[PDB]
Amino acid sequence: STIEEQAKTFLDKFNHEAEDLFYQSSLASWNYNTNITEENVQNMNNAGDKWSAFLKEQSTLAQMYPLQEIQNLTVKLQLQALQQNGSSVLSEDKSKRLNTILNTMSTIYSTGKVCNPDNPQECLLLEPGLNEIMANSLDYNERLWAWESWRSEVGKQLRPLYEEYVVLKNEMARANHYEDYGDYWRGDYEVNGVDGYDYSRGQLIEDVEHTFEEIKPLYEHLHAYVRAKLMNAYPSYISPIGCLPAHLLGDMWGRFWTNLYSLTVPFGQKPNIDVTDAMVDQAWDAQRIFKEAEKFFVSVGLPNMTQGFWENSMLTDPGNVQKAVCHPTAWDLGKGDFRILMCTKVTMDDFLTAHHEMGHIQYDMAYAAQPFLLRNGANEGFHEAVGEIMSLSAATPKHLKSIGLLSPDFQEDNETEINFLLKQALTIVGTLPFTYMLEKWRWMVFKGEIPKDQWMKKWWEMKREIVGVVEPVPHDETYCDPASLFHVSNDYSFIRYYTRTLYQFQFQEALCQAAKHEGPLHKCDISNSTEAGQKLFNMLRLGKSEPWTLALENVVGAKNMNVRPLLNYFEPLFTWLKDQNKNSFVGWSTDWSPYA
Amino acid sequence: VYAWNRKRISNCVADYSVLYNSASFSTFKCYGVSPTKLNDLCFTNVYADSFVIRGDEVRQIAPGQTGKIADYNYKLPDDFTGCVIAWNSNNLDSKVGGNYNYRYRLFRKSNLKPFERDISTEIYQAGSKPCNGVEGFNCYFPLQSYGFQPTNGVGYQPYRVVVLSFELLHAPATVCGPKKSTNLVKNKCVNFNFNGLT
Ligand SMILES: *[C@@H]1O[C@H](CO)[C@@H](O)[C@H](O)[C@H]1NC(C)=O
Ligand SMILES: *[C@@H]1O[C@H](CO)[C@@H](O)[C@H](O)[C@H]1NC(C)=O
Ligand SMILES: *[C@@H]1O[C@H](CO)[C@@H](O)[C@H](O)[C@H]1NC(C)=O
Ligand SMILES: *[C@@H]1O[C@H](CO)[C@@H](O)[C@H](O)[C@H]1NC(C)=O
Ligand SMILES: *[C@@H]1O[C@H](CO)[C@@H](O)[C@H](O)[C@H]1NC(C)=O
Ligand SMILES: *[C@@H]1O[C@H](CO)[C@@H](O)[C@H](O)[C@H]1NC(C)=O
């Protein structure tokens, strides 16, 4: 009869016939990941094509129901999600060209091999040939050669492709009632129709700038300290008044600063909190690691893992005969089937990764009650954030002492807290200016603020202004320096890390306040607190049914993203860095003072 | 579940203790009678309804419940006397390719009456528009297949449900429980109960 009942029956029909197809596609993807064979690749391709065709047909049927005659929030949200054209609105020739461009960029990035001229008999790929050199070398010219050669080859190949890509994506986005592709990406956080909890696409950029302005003093002090330490490591290259050289950040692109912990350690004499040896001595298997993680989740009050999880997951490397992807990934296959694919080793990093992926599994399990098309996070930030909070909680010394991995008589003095906080800042705080600068540059490129002939002149100017990183040598317009990163080349949003980082500490403050922790934020563990788990599970159960603003109100009590928990987390480190930067000069100059 | 089997059990002795003492059943919820006194009481007829549902849908097989199964597939009366027995059947009813032999009625204009079987295969009309016999837009086929895989979760795994319905009618009750004989003792003054004569 009415439009709302028709939409509800159609949505039921969609969820029922879409859950099984999604399960088949996900199972084919799992079979490919755990067993890399040509038939598995063919099965994955066939399942993906069937899934995409079914989604296209259901979207085509879905568009015939007008949005304005539906009052139920969940039904309206599912209809809005289904009725998106995506690439369908574009012409078949341009759609095929866009798909071909994306695939060829994927092949060029994945199979890109670059080596030194005059010695071409063998070459090194990016992983792990170039990663180890970027992360461990202390030689200026070798790192400079690797960075410049890889950007030269990849940028020169990808620059016309990127020029076509921006135009095609802008055409698709403007055809889809968006201002640009940046507006399309910013539409994920858009909330419409809820009184008081509405969020606009335009508000996201303003909020990011407002938070980053408060991020800037801490980043400036951290940059000054890292600059001083790198000056100690490399005597003549780094200038006291200028920016840091691009190839010296410890990674290929500057995404993380975690590879500079050895060079920039405050107290080298003091020991670390490494617990790898304790697990090796007591013969801790990967199964024990996952059982301890499960014990942590039942300690906080969340449901324990299913029998299917233990039976069907691959938590150890299979062997030489069977090939598998080594990247840790949590799979929500559908129909209550949750698995983790990780090549787990006896390391602290794998243990934290196991907690992070099991957090992903818990998040996936929580919204199983919801309809199929709403079985996701409220935004892209929350899904990563719920894993990151478990990663934060598991790494604390209190958690290690509780589970027996650390000695009960370990002395927790201020120096270990300072060096640990500095390492966490290098991993977490350091990615924020790079992420903000890259997303703002991409948004300006999509918007048309920056013409194609002026992409790099602005970009380096942005990098000096925001990231405090200077180019080693000037680059002309033949280079395509941003596209050397995995996320940008394969059509992925990059603001998820920034939102995840702010949400991570907001959630951490909320759970620690719930758990009645009375000390520093970084010394807080969320184990043994039922109320904290209940508060988290209230947001977790909703999934995508409710706006992200309402979920944030449910957890932290705020209607907007906030920057204060990050500053509160690193406040001892902030005071220590302010004390240590009395002699040095905080801030940088955008000029070519170190090298150009 | 749309075409649930009904078997009428009459003119025999029903031993309920074998079912009760089994550990193979996940749900043994009895409504209107208790399992302890089932082995003593006698009933006129026993209705055994058998079907397969999902793990999450076992709760809907009860009086007063609401759902797809209760409204459109199998409806139980409020004044129901009997037992609902359900057990996991992942071992037999799930195959690697997917077992799609089990179907459920997803849409019907009105709710089912208690103990009603609907085997109609007419296209459901969700809109004013005439369906015209073809399954197109706003017109859907009511019977939807089920997907059963051996790696599914416990809430999606197939569960076999047998519902026993006990009714007493004015006709003589013939489905009686197994009375247990004792050993015979002779030459002593004892209280004898022979075939109801005490
Ligand atoms: C992986 O694929 C090979 C190829 O035939 C097959 O023999 C083997 O059983 C597979 N192993 C698993 C765990 O799927
Ligand atoms: C919206 O629909 C869902 C399922 O279709 C239903 O459970 C919920 O009560 C509806 N909300 C309102 C306000 O009617
Ligand atoms: C999708 O595209 C079609 C035509 O290309 C258009 O009629 C329809 O309005 C679009 N959907 C939305 C939600 O705008
Ligand atoms: C998970 O929790 C349930 C209920 O608390 C319990 O019965 C079950 O044994 C647990 N599973 C494992 C593997 O510990
Ligand atoms: C740690 O505490 C001791 C004792 O108060 C103090 O002397 C030392 O300067 C502190 N170190 C740092 C890095 O705060
Ligand atoms: C949390 O509970 C476990 C289980 O009893 C216990 O072993 C652990 O010590 C508790 N945590 C703390 C900090 O006491």
mmCIF file of C-alpha atoms in Angstrom, chain A residues 84-341:
data_model
loop_
_atom_site.group_PDB
_atom_site.id
_atom_site.type_symbol
_atom_site.label_atom_id
_atom_site.label_comp_id
_atom_site.label_asym_id
_atom_site.label_seq_id
_atom_site.Cartn_x
_atom_site.Cartn_y
_atom_site.Cartn_z
ATOM 1 C CA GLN A 84 23.751 6.164 -4.832
ATOM 2 C CA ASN A 85 24.730 5.877 -8.493
ATOM 3 C CA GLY A 86 28.454 5.571 -7.858
ATOM 4 C CA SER A 87 30.152 5.126 -11.218
ATOM 5 C CA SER A 88 26.873 4.051 -12.888
ATOM 6 C CA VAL A 89 25.819 7.625 -13.763
ATOM 7 C CA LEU A 90 28.909 8.070 -15.964
ATOM 8 C CA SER A 91 29.013 6.883 -19.581
ATOM 9 C CA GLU A 92 30.148 3.316 -20.290
ATOM 10 C CA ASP A 93 33.246 4.441 -22.229
ATOM 11 C CA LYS A 94 34.391 6.778 -19.445
ATOM 12 C CA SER A 95 33.513 4.206 -16.759
ATOM 13 C CA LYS A 96 35.603 1.584 -18.574
ATOM 14 C CA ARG A 97 38.439 4.106 -18.950
ATOM 15 C CA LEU A 98 38.292 4.911 -15.218
ATOM 16 C CA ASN A 99 38.306 1.215 -14.276
ATOM 17 C CA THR A 100 41.235 0.554 -16.630
ATOM 18 C CA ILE A 101 43.140 3.530 -15.168
ATOM 19 C CA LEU A 102 42.554 2.284 -11.604
ATOM 20 C CA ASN A 103 43.656 -1.261 -12.496
ATOM 21 C CA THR A 104 46.792 -0.114 -14.343
ATOM 22 C CA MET A 105 47.734 2.188 -11.427
ATOM 23 C CA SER A 106 47.302 -0.797 -9.089
ATOM 24 C CA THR A 107 49.601 -2.923 -11.277
ATOM 25 C CA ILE A 108 52.197 -0.134 -11.634
ATOM 26 C CA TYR A 109 52.310 0.489 -7.870
ATOM 27 C CA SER A 110 52.280 -3.210 -6.924
ATOM 28 C CA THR A 111 54.876 -4.370 -9.475
ATOM 29 C CA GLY A 112 57.099 -1.278 -9.548
ATOM 30 C CA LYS A 113 60.797 -2.190 -9.445
ATOM 31 C CA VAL A 114 63.495 0.510 -9.422
ATOM 32 C CA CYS A 115 67.270 0.157 -9.080
ATOM 33 C CA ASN A 116 70.433 2.194 -9.571
ATOM 34 C CA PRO A 117 71.532 3.124 -13.122
ATOM 35 C CA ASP A 118 74.655 1.260 -14.452
ATOM 36 C CA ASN A 119 73.827 -1.817 -12.302
ATOM 37 C CA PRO A 120 70.541 -3.159 -13.747
ATOM 38 C CA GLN A 121 71.108 -6.945 -13.451
ATOM 39 C CA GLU A 122 68.822 -7.133 -10.399
ATOM 40 C CA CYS A 123 66.385 -4.592 -8.966
ATOM 41 C CA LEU A 124 64.589 -4.171 -5.645
ATOM 42 C CA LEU A 125 60.837 -3.869 -5.130
ATOM 43 C CA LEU A 126 59.229 -1.475 -2.640
ATOM 44 C CA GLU A 127 58.340 -4.201 -0.144
ATOM 45 C CA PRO A 128 60.590 -5.233 1.539
ATOM 46 C CA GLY A 129 63.552 -4.166 -0.611
ATOM 47 C CA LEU A 130 63.105 -0.412 -0.211
ATOM 48 C CA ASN A 131 61.286 -0.390 3.151
ATOM 49 C CA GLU A 132 64.281 -1.821 5.036
ATOM 50 C CA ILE A 133 66.659 0.679 3.392
ATOM 51 C CA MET A 134 64.400 3.616 4.280
ATOM 52 C CA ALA A 135 63.833 2.387 7.844
ATOM 53 C CA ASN A 136 67.394 1.377 8.791
ATOM 54 C CA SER A 137 70.028 3.201 6.706
ATOM 55 C CA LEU A 138 72.107 6.049 8.134
ATOM 56 C CA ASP A 139 73.658 7.100 4.800
ATOM 57 C CA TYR A 140 72.542 10.401 3.252
ATOM 58 C CA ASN A 141 73.228 9.720 -0.445
ATOM 59 C CA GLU A 142 71.791 6.174 -0.424
ATOM 60 C CA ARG A 143 68.471 7.334 1.053
ATOM 61 C CA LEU A 144 68.470 10.344 -1.295
ATOM 62 C CA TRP A 145 69.073 8.067 -4.301
ATOM 63 C CA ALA A 146 66.321 5.624 -3.325
ATOM 64 C CA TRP A 147 63.779 8.378 -2.631
ATOM 65 C CA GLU A 148 64.502 10.373 -5.791
ATOM 66 C CA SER A 149 64.719 7.325 -8.091
ATOM 67 C CA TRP A 150 61.445 5.802 -6.868
ATOM 68 C CA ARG A 151 59.605 9.127 -7.076
ATOM 69 C CA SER A 152 61.119 9.790 -10.522
ATOM 70 C CA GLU A 153 59.987 6.491 -12.042
ATOM 71 C CA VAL A 154 56.597 6.232 -10.299
ATOM 72 C CA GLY A 155 55.720 9.915 -10.744
ATOM 73 C CA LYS A 156 56.741 10.087 -14.413
ATOM 74 C CA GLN A 157 54.668 6.985 -15.153
ATOM 75 C CA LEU A 158 51.649 8.069 -13.066
ATOM 76 C CA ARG A 159 51.420 11.817 -13.886
ATOM 77 C CA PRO A 160 49.262 11.611 -17.105
ATOM 78 C CA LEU A 161 47.252 8.830 -15.468
ATOM 79 C CA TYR A 162 46.592 11.014 -12.412
ATOM 80 C CA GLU A 163 45.676 13.952 -14.674
ATOM 81 C CA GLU A 164 43.062 11.770 -16.380
ATOM 82 C CA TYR A 165 41.968 10.333 -13.007
ATOM 83 C CA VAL A 166 41.182 13.704 -11.395
ATOM 84 C CA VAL A 167 39.095 14.818 -14.406
ATOM 85 C CA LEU A 168 37.130 11.545 -14.550
ATOM 86 C CA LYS A 169 36.458 11.507 -10.793
ATOM 87 C CA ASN A 170 35.389 15.169 -10.865
ATOM 88 C CA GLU A 171 33.052 14.418 -13.791
ATOM 89 C CA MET A 172 31.492 11.490 -11.915
ATOM 90 C CA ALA A 173 31.159 13.520 -8.696
ATOM 91 C CA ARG A 174 29.550 16.530 -10.414
ATOM 92 C CA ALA A 175 27.238 14.102 -12.223
ATOM 93 C CA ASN A 176 26.256 12.740 -8.770
ATOM 94 C CA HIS A 177 25.094 16.154 -7.379
ATOM 95 C CA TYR A 178 28.399 16.840 -5.585
ATOM 96 C CA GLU A 179 30.675 19.868 -5.904
ATOM 97 C CA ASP A 180 33.797 17.730 -6.439
ATOM 98 C CA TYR A 181 35.269 14.354 -5.516
ATOM 99 C CA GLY A 182 36.345 15.913 -2.216
ATOM 100 C CA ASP A 183 32.698 16.669 -1.410
ATOM 101 C CA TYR A 184 31.902 13.033 -2.272
ATOM 102 C CA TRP A 185 34.513 11.867 0.247
ATOM 103 C CA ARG A 186 33.275 14.396 2.835
ATOM 104 C CA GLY A 187 29.699 13.134 2.372
ATOM 105 C CA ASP A 188 30.427 10.147 4.634
ATOM 106 C CA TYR A 189 30.172 12.401 7.702
ATOM 107 C CA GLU A 190 27.057 14.204 6.439
ATOM 108 C CA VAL A 191 24.027 13.897 8.722
ATOM 109 C CA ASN A 192 20.687 15.210 7.449
ATOM 110 C CA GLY A 193 17.186 15.045 8.895
ATOM 111 C CA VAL A 194 18.089 14.684 12.590
ATOM 112 C CA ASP A 195 17.232 17.702 14.732
ATOM 113 C CA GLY A 196 20.308 19.129 16.447
ATOM 114 C CA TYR A 197 22.681 16.362 15.309
ATOM 115 C CA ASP A 198 23.007 17.548 11.695
ATOM 116 C CA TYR A 199 26.532 17.712 10.274
ATOM 117 C CA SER A 200 27.451 19.391 6.998
ATOM 118 C CA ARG A 201 30.076 18.526 4.399
ATOM 119 C CA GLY A 202 31.456 22.064 4.640
ATOM 120 C CA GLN A 203 31.875 21.811 8.415
ATOM 121 C CA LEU A 204 34.409 18.954 8.193
ATOM 122 C CA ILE A 205 37.231 21.074 6.719
ATOM 123 C CA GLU A 206 36.631 23.849 9.286
ATOM 124 C CA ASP A 207 36.676 21.349 12.163
ATOM 125 C CA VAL A 208 39.895 19.771 10.830
ATOM 126 C CA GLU A 209 41.593 23.196 10.636
ATOM 127 C CA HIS A 210 40.334 24.166 14.112
ATOM 128 C CA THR A 211 41.695 20.954 15.649
ATOM 129 C CA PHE A 212 44.979 21.185 13.713
ATOM 130 C CA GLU A 213 45.583 24.737 14.984
ATOM 131 C CA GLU A 214 45.681 23.266 18.504
ATOM 132 C CA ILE A 215 47.758 20.317 17.240
ATOM 133 C CA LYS A 216 50.379 22.755 15.889
ATOM 134 C CA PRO A 217 52.277 23.757 19.133
ATOM 135 C CA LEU A 218 52.822 20.112 20.156
ATOM 136 C CA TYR A 219 53.884 19.202 16.614
ATOM 137 C CA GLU A 220 56.219 22.221 16.492
ATOM 138 C CA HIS A 221 57.942 21.169 19.729
ATOM 139 C CA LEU A 222 58.166 17.536 18.568
ATOM 140 C CA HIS A 223 59.531 18.669 15.186
ATOM 141 C CA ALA A 224 62.157 20.835 16.896
ATOM 142 C CA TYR A 225 63.255 17.942 19.127
ATOM 143 C CA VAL A 226 63.400 15.509 16.178
ATOM 144 C CA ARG A 227 65.296 18.143 14.158
ATOM 145 C CA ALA A 228 67.863 18.539 16.957
ATOM 146 C CA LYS A 229 68.307 14.759 17.249
ATOM 147 C CA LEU A 230 68.679 14.369 13.469
ATOM 148 C CA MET A 231 71.211 17.221 13.563
ATOM 149 C CA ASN A 232 73.132 15.178 16.120
ATOM 150 C CA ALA A 233 72.855 12.102 13.876
ATOM 151 C CA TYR A 234 73.691 13.971 10.644
ATOM 152 C CA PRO A 235 76.045 16.896 11.438
ATOM 153 C CA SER A 236 75.920 19.140 8.348
ATOM 154 C CA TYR A 237 72.730 18.384 6.369
ATOM 155 C CA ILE A 238 70.100 19.651 8.841
ATOM 156 C CA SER A 239 69.913 23.429 9.469
ATOM 157 C CA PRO A 240 68.894 24.929 12.845
ATOM 158 C CA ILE A 241 66.455 27.363 11.200
ATOM 159 C CA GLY A 242 65.081 25.219 8.357
ATOM 160 C CA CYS A 243 62.879 22.224 7.659
ATOM 161 C CA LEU A 244 63.790 18.536 7.885
ATOM 162 C CA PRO A 245 65.062 16.746 4.742
ATOM 163 C CA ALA A 246 62.344 14.610 3.152
ATOM 164 C CA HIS A 247 64.307 11.359 2.848
ATOM 165 C CA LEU A 248 65.330 11.267 6.540
ATOM 166 C CA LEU A 249 61.918 10.681 8.168
ATOM 167 C CA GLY A 250 62.419 6.920 8.580
ATOM 168 C CA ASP A 251 59.804 5.829 6.026
ATOM 169 C CA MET A 252 59.439 6.013 2.255
ATOM 170 C CA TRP A 253 56.830 8.787 2.287
ATOM 171 C CA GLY A 254 56.884 10.238 5.806
ATOM 172 C CA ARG A 255 53.675 8.509 6.943
ATOM 173 C CA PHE A 256 55.106 7.368 10.290
ATOM 174 C CA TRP A 257 58.038 8.510 12.408
ATOM 175 C CA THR A 258 58.308 5.210 14.321
ATOM 176 C CA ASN A 259 61.639 4.287 12.685
ATOM 177 C CA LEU A 260 63.453 7.178 14.405
ATOM 178 C CA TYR A 261 62.988 5.814 17.949
ATOM 179 C CA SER A 262 66.577 4.522 18.070
ATOM 180 C CA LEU A 263 68.026 7.858 16.916
ATOM 181 C CA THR A 264 65.704 10.076 18.990
ATOM 182 C CA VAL A 265 65.561 8.084 22.259
ATOM 183 C CA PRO A 266 65.529 10.339 25.363
ATOM 184 C CA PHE A 267 67.127 7.773 27.688
ATOM 185 C CA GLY A 268 69.082 5.153 25.750
ATOM 186 C CA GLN A 269 70.693 3.857 28.962
ATOM 187 C CA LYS A 270 67.329 2.828 30.425
ATOM 188 C CA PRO A 271 65.729 -0.451 29.272
ATOM 189 C CA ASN A 272 62.600 -0.790 27.162
ATOM 190 C CA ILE A 273 59.279 -2.440 28.005
ATOM 191 C CA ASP A 274 59.846 -5.186 25.426
ATOM 192 C CA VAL A 275 58.052 -8.383 26.453
ATOM 193 C CA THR A 276 59.110 -10.564 23.487
ATOM 194 C CA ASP A 277 61.750 -12.458 25.501
ATOM 195 C CA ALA A 278 59.233 -13.318 28.239
ATOM 196 C CA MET A 279 56.910 -14.960 25.697
ATOM 197 C CA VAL A 280 59.859 -16.776 24.080
ATOM 198 C CA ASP A 281 61.032 -18.130 27.463
ATOM 199 C CA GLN A 282 57.555 -19.346 28.450
ATOM 200 C CA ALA A 283 56.802 -20.726 24.928
ATOM 201 C CA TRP A 284 53.785 -18.539 24.210
ATOM 202 C CA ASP A 285 52.044 -19.746 21.048
ATOM 203 C CA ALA A 286 49.853 -17.516 18.848
ATOM 204 C CA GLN A 287 46.822 -19.414 20.179
ATOM 205 C CA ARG A 288 47.796 -18.311 23.697
ATOM 206 C CA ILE A 289 48.042 -14.702 22.449
ATOM 207 C CA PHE A 290 44.514 -14.851 21.029
ATOM 208 C CA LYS A 291 43.220 -16.566 24.191
ATOM 209 C CA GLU A 292 44.751 -13.789 26.330
ATOM 210 C CA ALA A 293 43.127 -11.190 24.056
ATOM 211 C CA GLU A 294 39.806 -13.033 24.450
ATOM 212 C CA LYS A 295 40.360 -13.001 28.223
ATOM 213 C CA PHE A 296 40.848 -9.223 28.027
ATOM 214 C CA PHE A 297 37.589 -8.803 26.095
ATOM 215 C CA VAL A 298 35.622 -10.971 28.523
ATOM 216 C CA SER A 299 37.302 -8.970 31.320
ATOM 217 C CA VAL A 300 35.903 -5.721 29.909
ATOM 218 C CA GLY A 301 32.460 -7.332 29.457
ATOM 219 C CA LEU A 302 32.280 -7.974 25.709
ATOM 220 C CA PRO A 303 31.101 -11.342 24.305
ATOM 221 C CA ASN A 304 33.728 -14.006 23.662
ATOM 222 C CA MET A 305 34.642 -15.430 20.264
ATOM 223 C CA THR A 306 32.465 -17.971 18.471
ATOM 224 C CA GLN A 307 33.364 -21.614 17.869
ATOM 225 C CA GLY A 308 33.526 -20.848 14.140
ATOM 226 C CA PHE A 309 36.210 -18.231 14.817
ATOM 227 C CA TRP A 310 38.504 -20.740 16.524
ATOM 228 C CA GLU A 311 37.818 -23.516 14.006
ATOM 229 C CA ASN A 312 38.048 -21.507 10.770
ATOM 230 C CA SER A 313 40.704 -18.834 11.369
ATOM 231 C CA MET A 314 44.295 -19.071 10.160
ATOM 232 C CA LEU A 315 46.401 -17.705 13.019
ATOM 233 C CA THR A 316 49.714 -19.283 11.958
ATOM 234 C CA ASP A 317 51.602 -19.212 8.659
ATOM 235 C CA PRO A 318 50.503 -22.347 6.736
ATOM 236 C CA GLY A 319 53.851 -23.383 5.266
ATOM 237 C CA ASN A 320 56.055 -23.241 2.201
ATOM 238 C CA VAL A 321 53.638 -25.204 -0.019
ATOM 239 C CA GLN A 322 50.645 -22.902 0.602
ATOM 240 C CA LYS A 323 50.903 -19.190 -0.182
ATOM 241 C CA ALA A 324 49.003 -16.587 1.818
ATOM 242 C CA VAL A 325 48.898 -12.820 2.185
ATOM 243 C CA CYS A 326 50.851 -11.883 5.294
ATOM 244 C CA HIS A 327 48.885 -8.708 6.114
ATOM 245 C CA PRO A 328 46.711 -9.053 9.253
ATOM 246 C CA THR A 329 43.047 -8.681 8.335
ATOM 247 C CA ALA A 330 39.815 -9.329 10.234
ATOM 248 C CA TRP A 331 37.096 -10.764 7.999
ATOM 249 C CA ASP A 332 33.368 -10.431 8.699
ATOM 250 C CA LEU A 333 32.285 -12.976 6.105
ATOM 251 C CA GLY A 334 28.576 -12.726 6.929
ATOM 252 C CA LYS A 335 25.974 -14.978 8.602
ATOM 253 C CA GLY A 336 27.809 -14.782 11.913
ATOM 254 C CA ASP A 337 31.130 -15.984 10.467
ATOM 255 C CA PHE A 338 34.070 -13.988 11.854
ATOM 256 C CA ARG A 339 37.702 -14.882 11.116
ATOM 257 C CA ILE A 340 41.179 -13.387 11.530
ATOM 258 C CA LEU A 341 43.889 -13.914 8.888
#
